[PDB]
């Protein structure tokens, strides 16, 4: 659908937003916890992607409540965004099979 | 659809390509960073799959920008490829339920 392709692009954008929110907020939330690793924006941003794709290589994670609260948002966003894309591929194909026969 | 099955196979191929790009490039990008582990093609290729399926056992990861930039591409490819397959299963079933009633 024109809707499904719109929704897909929009998710992509929002994800990038969240990732960027993700890093700023992660750093902002973990500075003050001794032993926190998640305390510079560029590594917060690496951390944000591997969280959002649910790769979790485990090089980096939050140790504080708001670290983990943020991380949850980022996870959820990520998983949503990629699902919507898959749905938007599903709708395109279904559409193209509909007309195929009628 | 004939389209959805075409698209599925094509993703499969591209993924294999990316995996292979993935390894060559990972090795090419991490040799020169002391302590990098991701510096031989065969282990770059193990690394490339667990990244692309988002298993991340965490035995292996990149430590450099282009390591991580490459890794992102590989993630994204992986997640896309398997989504398209699921979509291409969704279209097949929808099609087979359509005719079932009409």
């Amino acid at each position: 659908s024109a809707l499904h392709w719109r929704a897909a692009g929009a998710a992509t954008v929002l994800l990038v937003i969240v990732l960027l929110a993700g890093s700023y907020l992660a750093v902002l939330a973990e500075r003050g916890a001794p032993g926190a690793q998640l305390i510079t924006y560029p590594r917060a941003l690496w951390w944000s992607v591997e969280t959002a794709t649910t790769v979790g290589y485990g090089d980096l994670y939050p140790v504080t409540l708001w670290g983990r609260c943020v991380a949850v948002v980022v996870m959820v966003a990520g998983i949503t965004s990629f699902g919507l894309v898959t749905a938007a591929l599903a709708t395109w194909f279904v559409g193209r099979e509909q007309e195929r026969r009628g | 659809s004939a389209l959805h099955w075409r698209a599925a196979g094509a993703a499969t191929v591209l993924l294999v390509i990316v995996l292979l790009a993935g390894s060559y490039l990972a090795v090419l990008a991490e040799r020169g960073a002391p302590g990098a582990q991701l510096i031989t093609y065969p282990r770059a290729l193990w690394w490339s799959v667990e990244t692309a399926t988002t298993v991340g056992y965490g035995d292996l990861y990149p430590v450099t920008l282009w390591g991580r930039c490459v890794a992102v591409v590989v993630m994204v490819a992986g997640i896309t490829s398997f989504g398209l397959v699921t979509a291409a299963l969704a279209t097949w079933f929808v099609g087979r339920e359509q005719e079932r009633r009409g």
Epitope: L28, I39, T40 | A33
Partner: antibody, heavy 119, light 108 residues
Amino acid sequence: SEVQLVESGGGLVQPGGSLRLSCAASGYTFTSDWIHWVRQAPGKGLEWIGEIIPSYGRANYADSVKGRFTISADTSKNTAYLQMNSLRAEDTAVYYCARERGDGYFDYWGQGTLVTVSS
Amino acid sequence: DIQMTQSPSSLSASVGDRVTITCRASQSIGTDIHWYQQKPGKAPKLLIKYASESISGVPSRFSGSRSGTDFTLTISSLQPEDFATYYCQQSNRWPFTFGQGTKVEIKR
């Protein structure tokens, strides 16, 4: 240099007294920048002491500084401050403020000011 | 808290000579070390970032290197101007901490 951090405040304080130091921007500063405070007791190393993002205005501190000291910021003036209470002789040192972009290093520092603690 | 430990704690090399300053991290910190030069009475000046990355305006005699827990600032050809105390500093783990300092006296 450019984005010169100027420092204000600094002098003699009574053991247990209060002194408000100051750090002014005087340059282009991203909204996300942290201002840090860094100590050097006479003939000794540098000691990290505290950070603030002037914008969200949340501040963190080293154990040595505890809740004796409070870091504040006036975003209207582009002037971040350090409020010192409890002052021991330990606290006798030069205090440098310094800018960090959130990467984890200090590109521009302040001229530094002595705080001397003596009855 | 991550202990940066510099080496030696002071140096007198002849000008033109090759001088190296070790700084051992107490745990792996990646490459999140940065070197500063402090001339007597002045504010510290950043020399190297991220282990090797060089700063705009710093001379070429200054190079940071090394991995493992070990990190090394090298002044290729010691100058008279290089009379300073040099500090390493970690960004790996909160809070940021500094090394004890290494003081370079010129010999002549």
